[PDB]
């Protein structure tokens, strides 16, 4: 049988048990947004029920993956061809069966992802009963990734997450032209989790597939990025996200995905084409989340919060000890990063989710900061 | 990883230079051509709120226990809160589950019947498992068994009853045999129960009814997967369960956690008014029922179980047919070839009852005279 560790939120809740808060204060362990769904979103759903008799294609509507490749050529300058983008039902399933799809008849596969990580990388690595080389991700060298050489040799499928979960760190384009290169000249599958590509405060991230037209693959050869509607759209109930890049791959990934029942009502999907299509809602909540950032960084003095992502990796002297004292007095919810992560990584950080409207920050990140200043 | 055609390929395929000379009525697809009930799409515009809500992997425990209720009305059986898992319809199950209980067997070996569908060789193929296939026949009076040497060699069995495409049931004594075989050889026992509710007459009984009488009543290596789909004409809704053993469905909960097989909250409660509801069930098991009365009055001395809406209509070739009536009517029948390996189903085509009685009377009447002359 496949071992099943537990939760970071488990963790969690395990280690704040035995406290009764003396204060009433914000929860900013979980990274997921407060914030009410578009109307024009609901509006579409609402419009189109009378579709729920129609059993739902696994490729999903032509309208949705037409709109999610508009919103690639938009954000990103690309113009992705029919056979280079699958529509899929959020992220997270990708995010777990791919590997398992692309290494599906290895031998002793070997999967690279960060340290530390959203818990779905270590997930799939086990589903498909893969050796994990985990890159960690470090103050020394600026929370950079990196394999040596014999491990380039031996890997199979590294995973990238850039902007990521919890550091916030995000790779330029010239660091994701190396990365392609490395997986073109050592034949590797390359992934990047592109969810919070959606999530900055001023310049926006670059996309994986951007570097692979500047690194000589407009094919999107061994390259893939993962992309999600949930957090650009406040509308995570919708589940839907895309997988985009080495058209080979997904031509196969395709006819895989018709035997794994990964359906959503067509209701759902004219919701999501909706939201695919408009940029205006999306800029109103990363508004927010880019105040959110800038607001934290005047707060918590000499530390590094880059602009990307909605979080804040809080370095502090231990994250165990600082999230019970800051529950126990000021009843704030943080999460110690050491349970997003293997070998004592994140040890000495809580990861902080900047998930609500910017007032309501103002006074709980000062606290924060009142008990990890000197 | 290899991909085998899908029926609705081959059908594609073998009429493909073929115009038809009238338009005429398609049978070959399997799903009901009704409207969704006005009370579950309003059910789903009036909770377009939650979708701003991460909805959970064991979905809402409100919808559960709209599930857990509607087994008791209908097999007279209470479920524990551990033994009934929500899940995004039947397909994603039948195809997940064989993975999941079989993830580290030595040498997995499944067994079905013959004609089936297909998912269950898809799940097969997937957990690398050696299929033995149960052949059903007008000799056998479509029994499925096993011989001594394949129950003990055999991991896990998966029937169908009421069947697609035959329309065999099993009656009570029957299922009792099957538990009492899990228990004395050790494997694990399925019932597919999508076809549950879809029934001329008497109900036909459900595995887990079977345990209570052959004293299995925790469930022990048994489980039933059961649909909304074809009871409610909501495939859209994508929401079934499934029922039985709670020492494995408490690990496949913990499995489920990873898969992100998650539906939109309102959609979920879209889902809970049609499990609480008996009377628009019954509105169209009726018009089932006629369709089966119907099919039995034109085809004359052929067999017709009034279990499921199929025809399992004998011809001289199913292929030939299919292509006969396709050029000449326009009528499009699905030849059972396509649903069996082994060339079981060569002289049948399969008939979906799945539209509204009086537009069946036609199309079944020429089919009759295509069979009376040759």
Redesign the interface.
């Known amino acids: 049988?496949?071992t099943?560790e537990p939760?970071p939120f488990e963790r969690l809740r395990a280690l704040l048990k035995e406290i009764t808060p003396k204060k009433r204060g914000l929860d900013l362990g979980i990274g997921?947004?407060q914030?009410?769904?578009p109307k024009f979103?609901?509006?579409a759903?609402?419009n189109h029920?009378?579709?729920?008799?129609?059993?739902?294609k696994s490729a999903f509507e032509e309208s949705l993956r037409a709109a999610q490749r508009g919103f690639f050529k938009r954000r990103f300058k690309i113009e992705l061809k029919e056979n280079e983008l699958i529509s899929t039902?959020?992220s997270?399933?990708?995010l777990?069966?791919f590997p398992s799809?692309v290494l599906?008849?290895y031998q002793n596969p070997t999967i690279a992802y960060p340290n530390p990580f959203y818990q779905?990388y270590e997930?799939?690595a086990k589903?498909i009963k893969a050796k994990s080389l985990l890159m960690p991700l470090t103050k020394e060298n600026d929370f950079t990734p990196s394999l040596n050489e014999k491990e380039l040799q031996e890997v199979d499928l590294v995973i990238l997450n850039s902007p990521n979960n919890p550091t916030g760190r995000t790779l330029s384009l010239e660091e994701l032209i190396s990365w392609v290169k490395l997986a073109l000249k050592h034949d590797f599958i390359l992934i990047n989790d592109e969810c919070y590509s959606e999530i900055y405060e001023n310049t926006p991230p670059p996309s994986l597939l951007e570097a692979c037209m500047l690194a000589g693959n407009e094919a999107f050869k061994n390259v893939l990025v993962i992309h999600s509607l949930?957090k650009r759209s406040?509308?995570?109930?919708?589940?839907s996200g895309f997988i985009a890049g080495d058209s080979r791959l997904l031509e196969?990934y395709k006819?895989?995905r018709?035997?794994?029942?990964?359906?959503?009502?067509?209701?759902?999907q004219k919701?999501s084409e909706a939201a695919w299509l408009d940029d205006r809602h999306a800029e109103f909540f990363r508004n927010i989340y880019a105040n959110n950032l800038k607001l934290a960084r005047k707060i918590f003095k000499n530390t590094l919060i880059y602009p990307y992502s909605f979080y804040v990796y809080l370095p502090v002297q231990n994250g165990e000890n600082f999230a019970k004292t800051l529950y126990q007095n000021e009843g704030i919810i943080t999460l110690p990063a050491l349970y997003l992560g293997r070998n004592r990584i994140g040890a000495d950080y809580v990861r902080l989710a900047l998930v609500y409207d910017t007032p309501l920050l103002e006074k709980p990140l000062e606290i924060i900061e009142t008990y990890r200043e000197n």
């Open positions: 049988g496949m099943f939760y997921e947004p914030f009410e769904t979103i609901q509006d759903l609402k029920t009378h579709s729920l008799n129609i059993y739902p039902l959020g997270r399933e990708v777990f069966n799809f599906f008849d779905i997930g799939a589903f949930s406040s509308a995570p109930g919708l589940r196969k006819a895989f018709a035997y794994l029942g990964y359906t959503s009502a067509n209701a759902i919701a």
